[PDB]
From a paper:
NoMnmE crystals with sufficient diffraction were obtained in a PEG 550 monomethyl ether (MME) condition. CtMnmE·GDP and NoMnmE·GDP (grown in presence of AlFx) crystallized in the space groups I4(1)22 and P4(3)2(1)2, respectively, each with one full length protomer in the asymmetric unit. In both cases homodimers are formed via crystallographic symmetry by means of the N-terminal domains. Strikingly, two molecules of 5-formyl-tetrahydrofolate (5-F-THF) were identified in the structure of NoMnmE·GDP, which were apparently copurified from the bacterial expression system. This suggests a high affinity for 5-F-THF and supports the recently proposed enzymatic mechanism whereby the C1 group of the cmnm modification is donated by THF. In NoMnmE·GDP, two Zn2+ atoms from the crystallisation condition, localized by their anomalous signal, are coordinated to the G domain. One of these is coordinated to helix Gα4 and is involved in crystal contacts (see below), the other occupies the usual Mg2+-binding site at the β-phosphate of GDP. As Switch I is resolved, but does not contact the bound GDP and since there is no indication for a physiological role of Zn2+, we consider this to be a crystallographic artefact also observed in the nucleotide binding pockets of other small G proteins. In NoMnmE·GDP a Zn2+-ion tightly links the G domain to symmetry mates, while in CtMnmE·GDP the G domains fix each other by a toothing upside-down arrangement.
Numbering used by the authors:
A (entry chain A), B (entry chain A): -2 to 275, 296 to 459
């Protein structure tokens, strides 16, 4: 019953862990029992100094014996100078699938409880090292699948999003203290400037409208695009992948945990993470239909076009190295298509045009409303519009000139809604949900 | 052309890395350029001390700009007090699939070269911090898929295997200096005790024979068993897995990188890692044939038995909760089977008997010749027998009583063969092959 209050000492595995990959694996412990557990588990030879921000060498051993568990490194982060602001220790094990398990188990046995998803980064927020926008954005950092998705996440982490919103809430709180002091103290204050505070709302709701503009970029860099490739057999679907993948793959270096099929399908086009799925995919945001220009449009092309035409579509005209130049514009295709691209897959050319076509079909809303790499998410934008509505709800009731009693209801609503975002005023259901979608160890 | 000589400064990703899992990911740099690269890349606020074994907080930034790449922790390991004995730095990034890539790239740009498989742990050996048996066993540690496979690997790491072999090589070198001084200095030394040194060989070849006994345990804990489950549809194959898996799974806690299907199939029986494959599997060491005791043996049972009978086989008689007690011994099955087990899969009982049957079918050679958790591998055992052969080759030529000239050839061979194991005398082809089967970052 009810988190929001730090009571125990928590431990979890802090790194990805796969059976025969990766040199090292961490186990992180945080809480008032942290150093006590490192104390009773880590054997550090030849009197090394046990201070904060000090690396130690030794052996994690006794499970009630002295039976050595790993040759490990110990990290100490004491004081409020840690991730969670609590005392933090880290065991740096070899870690296949065995050592970390063994060490974690020894932690639970020494009075640590198993941390829940996001619980480390919650305790960070709970001790006022982070606000919600920051907490949220570190999940965005490790969740990023493109260089600019990270850039956007890093901006969130850095506080670039927490600073404006907390600034705006202060403003509403200030023009709330003005109205609330007049309503209570007889004279002792000259009357309100009825149209100066319609100009203050016009300032605030303007800034929060600039933020709500980024919302689209946010959804794209976070979720990315789900792209299906359809076509007939021997048209060049697999050939299309290779060409596109080689110049657009998200993984350019060999990466221990990840399997080649995710390295192959997870790529990036003009900043947007693009994920290639494997007539079936209505789960796709955009579909690439591939026909063979060497034989031109066929009946098999028509039918699978009939299945996918309701979804955003790009016709990929493959094997143009086989048609001669003068006859390219002569090639037949159903007239409703507005996005056609000629590619020579085996020759690895055309993917530059494919990119332009994919970016084009996306920038019909506003992908050219982008300013910098700061972008809010769904939940943040949800609370911002609701703060905007409630804010111009007051922007109406002061032109009607009701008494100060019927101004204060809606202003509070705006302050509370902005309080949701940074987290000075959040329901615990909202709070639990935020951290529940974090992975374990985070 | 030719490793075996440290020239550059190397960098690689030291942890497993999967797209949306694991709180942190390391990038390790080692060499004379290590600290210089941390210098020019890690922004550490408010003058923190830059000493060895010190944890630093800050921001990995400029790619020729100042553009922040991650909020990271820096680890410094200077002097010969490191993994590789060189100067070692570690960047501890957030790491999804983006941050570590970004940081590694910035390392290559600052004069680091990308480390090759095992190259860190080779440089450790190359600077005499480890012998080959130890180097080999750290790959065994992260490669282990059972608690005792780790225990065995840790023994190797600890030096429990390097100590005896280097001891034995010294002995051969000593009884080589005795013979070689007599052959060269006129008198100046009383003649050899011809049957004292047949007793010395009887001591050495005895100890190296005790080691060669473990070879079997070694192969089992390293490779483990590949077990296939065959049967007809609706017999209880999937039901068998669950029951067996729940009390024998190798992963008892939630582990970021690994997928449920590897958590499900990778289990352990009496110490041996057992991997469950998915009429087809001759790639299996042991097969479990499952029939349905409720309907008894069928014709479909017979045919798939005809496919798998040449492989070691255990008949799993499933659904015994449906046959009544007196009629169990009455159930018909082909007479050549010597290993039958009754299981009630849905009721989760029988897996204790299955274990006993699986251990039984394996301990026909010598799995009860085991003493402790020290066990040599294929390559080590290969060089040991060859040292043994060459050692009793001398154990013959001194009973024939040839001159001291025709003793020295074979003794050297034994010393050289034992020199292969710890690594004081290795071909570079052997050396390259050893580290080539390590994963990257290791
Ligand atoms: N090994 C490792 N463990 C982790 O828990 C971890 C990494 N690496 N890499 C990134 C880091 C997240 N970043 C942080 C954030 C704050 C502090 C910290 O000590 N708190 C102080 C700063 C110290 C100072 O100013 O001197 C603070 O008050 O913010 C440390 C690391 N992180 C988690 O993913
Ligand atoms: N973060 C991290 N990085 C690593 O490279 C690493 C881990 N963890 N965990 C286990 C460790 C392998 N173990 C070692 C071995 C030797 C030293 C070392 O500093 N060498 C000295 C010991 C220092 C002393 O005696 O005070 C030596 O001479 O052996 C450090 C870690 N290892 C890699 O997988
Ligand atoms: N000339 C030419 N041949 C191609 C091109 N793309 C694919 N092919 C050939 O067409 C065959 C079928 O391609 P494939 O990728 O397997 O099509 P899929 O079955 O839809 O995956 C392959 O043998 C390729 O060599 C192209 O752009 N030009
Ligand atoms: N009474 C009984 N029923 C079982 C047992 N094992 C499996 N079943 C039932 O038999 C059905 C088929 O089992 P299943 O695991 O799917 O067999 P598979 O098709 O070979 O994978 C399931 O619906 C189970 O409920 C058992 O030990 N006892
Ligand atoms: Zn194909
Ligand atoms: Zn036509
Ligand atoms: Zn089945
Ligand atoms: Zn019969």
């Amino acid at each position: 019953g009810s988190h929001m209050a730090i009571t125990g000492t928590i431990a979890a595995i802090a790194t990805a862990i796969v059976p025969q990959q990766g040199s090292v694996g961490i186990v992180r412990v945080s809480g008032s029992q942290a150093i006590a557990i490192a104390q009773t588990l880590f054997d550090a030879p030849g009197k090394q100094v046990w201070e904060s921000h000090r690396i130690l060498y030794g052996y994690i051993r006794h499970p009630q014996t002295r039976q050595i568990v790993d040759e490990a490194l110990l990290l100490l982060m004491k004081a409020p100078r840690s991730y969670t602001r609590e005392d933090v220790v880290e065991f740096h094990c070899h870690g296949g699938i065995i050592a970390v398990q063994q060490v974690l188990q020894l932690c639970l046995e020494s009075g640590a409880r198993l941390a829940q998803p996001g619980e480390f980064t919650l305790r960070a927020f709970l001790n006022g090292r982070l606000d919600l926008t920051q907490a949220e954005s570190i999940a965005d950092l490790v969740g990023a699948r493109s260089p600019q998705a990270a850039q956007t996440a890093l901006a969130g982490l850095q506080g670039k999003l927490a600073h404006p919103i907390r600034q705006l809430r202060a403003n509403c709180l200030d023009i709330l203290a003005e109205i609330e002091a007049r309503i209570d103290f007889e004279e002792d204050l000259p009357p309100l400037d009825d149209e100066a505070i319609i100009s203050d709302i016009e300032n605030i709701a303007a800034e929060i409208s600039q933020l709500l503009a980024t919302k689209d970029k946010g959804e794209l860099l976070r979720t990315g695009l789900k792209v299906a490739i359809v076509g007939r057999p021997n048209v060049g679907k697999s050939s299309l992948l290779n060409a596109w993948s080689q110049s657009d793959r998200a993984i350019v270096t060999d990466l221990p945990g990840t399997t080649r099929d995710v390295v192959e399908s997870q790529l990036v086009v003009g900043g947007i993470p693009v994920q290639v799925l494997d007539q079936a995919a209505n789960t796709a945001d955009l579909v690439l239909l591939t026909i063979d220009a060497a034989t031109g449009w066929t009946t098999g092309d028509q039918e699978i076009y009939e299945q996918v035409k309701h979804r955003p579509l790009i016709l990929v005209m493959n094997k143009i190295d086989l048609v001669e130049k003068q006859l390219i514009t002569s090639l037949e295709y159903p007239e409703n298509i507005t996005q056609i691209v000629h590619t020579a897959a085996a020759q690895k050319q055309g993917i530059d045009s494919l990119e332009t076509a994919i970016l084009e079909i996306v920038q019909t809303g506003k992908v050219q409303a982008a300013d910098m790499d700061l972008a809010i998410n769904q939940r943040q934008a949800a609370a911002l519009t609701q703060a905007k509505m409630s804010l111009e709800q007051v922007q109406a009731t002061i032109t009607q000139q009701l008494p100060l009693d019927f101004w204060t209801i809606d202003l509070r609503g705006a302050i509370q809604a902005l309080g949701e975002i940074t987290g000075e005023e959040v329901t615990e259901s909202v709070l639990d949900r935020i951290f529940s979608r974090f992975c374990i160890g985070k």
